[model samples]
Target: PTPNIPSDFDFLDATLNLERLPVEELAELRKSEPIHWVDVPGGTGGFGDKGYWLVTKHADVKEVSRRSDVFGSSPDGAIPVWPQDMTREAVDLQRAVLLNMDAPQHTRLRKIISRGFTPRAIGRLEDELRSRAQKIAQTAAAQGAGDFVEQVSCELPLQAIAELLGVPQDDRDKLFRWSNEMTAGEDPEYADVDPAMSSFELISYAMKMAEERAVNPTEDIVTKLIEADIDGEKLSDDEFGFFVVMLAVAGNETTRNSITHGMIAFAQNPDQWELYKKERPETAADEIVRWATPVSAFQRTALEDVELGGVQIKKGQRVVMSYRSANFDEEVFEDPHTFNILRSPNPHVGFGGTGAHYCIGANLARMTINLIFNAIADNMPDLKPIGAPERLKSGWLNGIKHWQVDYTGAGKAS
Candidate 1:
């Protein structure tokens, strides 16, 4: 039985204006109906005609994320919805990706993937990443003014991932394009592209690279992945392809949007910008990610009949955890709406909760955000948005497609 939701609560509406977070409605749900149910109209894809539980409170979302034994990621994958044209076979193939698997297999593949992202491995890249950030900042400053998303926000993470994966310099643009087309299917500009086809192309490219690395090993992460073994088992070619595609797309989109949203926050709140320049505190990046909450929600399927947040959830039902709502939960964050760089104990689940599926690139993402913003402060402290920024139309990704900014510096040396 579906619970009666207030008429004003439109958080479930796919056509709702996503230019801003629906903070008020989320707050209302957290206070009155932490575990609520909403119906999805037919032809809407994954949850279409099946509806699902919408978990709003921070604690409830954390519970769902951590209890993977009860709430599974496989069978249906993490996405609450699928493309209208997608086939079940394609969905099953996508389930092979790290983000969509359950235990045992997920545990083994995660162990192998962790070898490439070990602390020492990521730490070793800081100096090179810093140099890249400085160069990107200098180039943007040289242009005087342009789209911040293209010039600054997108470059560092793309370069970082490409270098990490040993992708050729000439092929980096393909990653950016594929990721855009994959996530921007709802936007008119990208409506023609088939997200599944983009994934296929990316996987094909990655498989070729894996084959080449198997024959001729190199110093890149692909070679490392090829050599990496867990319990005497190395990743298969199909696994390698899916892993690379996930890294390329997830690595590019999430961190890119974090930086862009951080810039917008700083521009809107100049005091925070001043504080950032003065302190450059480590907590700043986390706060920015919490504020942005780039990936809005992730879905999990109930493995058995259970109760969550005092609500009865039956087996085979889908549960959507709204990270956007959890990030701003008043019970957790102090003055949840304010952008405070010095926020401490900020356990916001912007990187997913404490679960097996928690983001693997979390450390790399934080470092990338910190380095790029530091370069921005050093090179163009006065950079500000020129006008209203254009937002992405997708319900899954909270993205900004175009944001023009004035990047004129104080005549600083590059």
Candidate 2:
């Protein structure tokens, strides 16, 4: 069931190849190969073994993602788990975050973070969310013909997540900068400082917040996290730092890129934009998330020998579920390559499937995309790009660093 993959094929080779072109290649591979072993040059995934299996079909990815018990993110952290210089202690620190946990530990931490992102919780903040979104659009329109990615796409997540964390709105730039830094990795433009420096600074900030919340409690998630107690177990300070960092970084990045890519889709497919406004497809949000697939891929390691898509994955071998590929699987979705706004029966793995580890902020992410697009559709229907946009050079993040647009808010009295 596995095809003869190229000896030089490596997903992590380049950001552009991984983000855009590879989908086309993977799409071809899906038709021909389906599943195969990939030999990564850097065996260490930055520093393990020679490589792992690459799963590029819809059903296979869903099966792999859903069966967390069989495929774990643990022992070695999630994708690119540790840095080349990572120590044993450093690896332990990385697993403290729920992203890399299995079962019991992940479930426990999930409970604490889940309370803040539930639909009811997000609903409580709708008025404020809309108001922020309105202000963001209004500001961008006022500036007229600016980089929407910087001016608009990134603003909402930074401020909204800050609100949940009880950080000041004005201090949101710190969250924006730090979150970008963490995911920037070795990208020069995006990461001026070392990622470790960014990680340490963020952890320090979280520790400071935890210390403050401990002494002077508040009605915020951070405070709740500081006082988190589950079945007589609690998150240690370091654990708390890792969890907060994951939220602050991942929460900000994924949503930001989704909005950015969504905007690009609208600009590229103006007809779809009109259809999006007219039909207002019930699946609009899911379509956008599916189209962009901001997170790209999340790697998993097998706890035991497993047969995925007919390829035998031995114990300790890594298997990567290419969400982008799965989203465009012809077997699962008709017109998989076409960017149709009216796509229904869209069972996209954009939020990592219906697994227990499904994105905790899934509801909030949908809410944000809907709110921001609603704001744009209502106030700036005429909005369109001014020129070419800049794409992020990092493979891990499906991003548009800058998107210049010309819009004055459809002459609405803002």
Candidate 3:
């Protein structure tokens, strides 16, 4: 039985009609048709010909994410959209990525990568991250008014990733451009650039770096990855390259967008900002991730015929877990639209829920968000957006391209 979908509704549409998120529509879907099917329009590339299941409700999204044995990431890869000209060979290449691999391959690679991203490792970087955030915030505040995304949001994450990967200071812009181009497939501004080429270029660069680290080892993640051993198992050069590509892109994009969205949220809800300044509650960063839903959705393919959310999902079907919708599910969250930093028991799957595939950088991202927001609240209390933000045109990422803001810095006042 096909649920009646509004003719105008297309989840993959890059255009944001008034609302930054499709909040109301998703609410209606969750209430009536939680396991809705969406037909990707022709121009959208990958999933255009065939539709996929849209898993909206909190419980369903969690269920699908956790039951990776049934719903596998390796089938068609985690990304919903593929390049228009993508081939089987290309698809095979992409499956080498940790995001696209299923266990035991996924488990093995993850274990190797996990050694570099352990809680102790992440915790050790907090002091450095805090100081970096302070410097970045102070610099941005001193500038008075500019694009917040460029000046403030992008800096800390980019620097942190660079430091982690041992990327040279001069090459940071290359990382920015490559990451942007890789994610800019649906956007008009990046129409000329091929997303696959961006991935290939990044991989090539990473392979070179891996070779260098192999010859002259350092304390960076690349070195750690090359040296990583689990049960006497280690990552090959190709695997190392693929992992670096993931880290460089994933590390830079999501946290920056979360910080950008947090700023926008705080600007709109001054009360929340004031509350945040007063308390500096640990929950604030999680709230920002929930509110932003940076990586909006990820795709998993059904390993076999299964019943999920009262819907019969067939074998080899695509199921998209809508993190955006799950985060705002009224069933799970009280006043689902409200940006409450104190909202405890916040099991929002901003970091992709409790599963083997949960974001490895979750702790690092939280620390980065917390430190940056702390810096902003402390040094730029008067900061506020002056104009509407220019949002990134991509369904995969809820990103702000540019946001103009004004502030009379406390540091400047002193």
Q: Number of clashing residue pairs in every model? A: 0, 2, 0
For each candidate, the alpha-carbon lDDT, in order, equals 0.82, 0.75, 0.80
TM-score of 3: 0.91
Write the residue-wise lDDT of candidate 1 on 70-149 in tens digits.
99999778876555555666566667688999889999898888878878778877898999999999899988888999
Tens-place lDDT per residue, model 2, 42-144, is 6553425676677789898889888999888876666543334445565555665788889888987777767667666677667888988988887877766
User: What does candidate 1 score on TM?
Assistant: 0.93
Task: Give the better candidate number (1 or 2) by lDDT.
Answer: 1
Q: After superposition, which runs of candidate 2 have C-alpha atoms over 4 Å from their true positions?
A: 1-5, 15-19, 41-44, 80-93, 227-230, 233-238, 279-281, 408-414
TM-score: which is higher, 1 or 2? Answer: 1
What TM-scores do the predictions have?
A: 0.93, 0.89, 0.91
Candidate 3 clashing pairs? none
Q: Model 2 — which ten-residue stretch has the worst lDDT?
A: 79-88
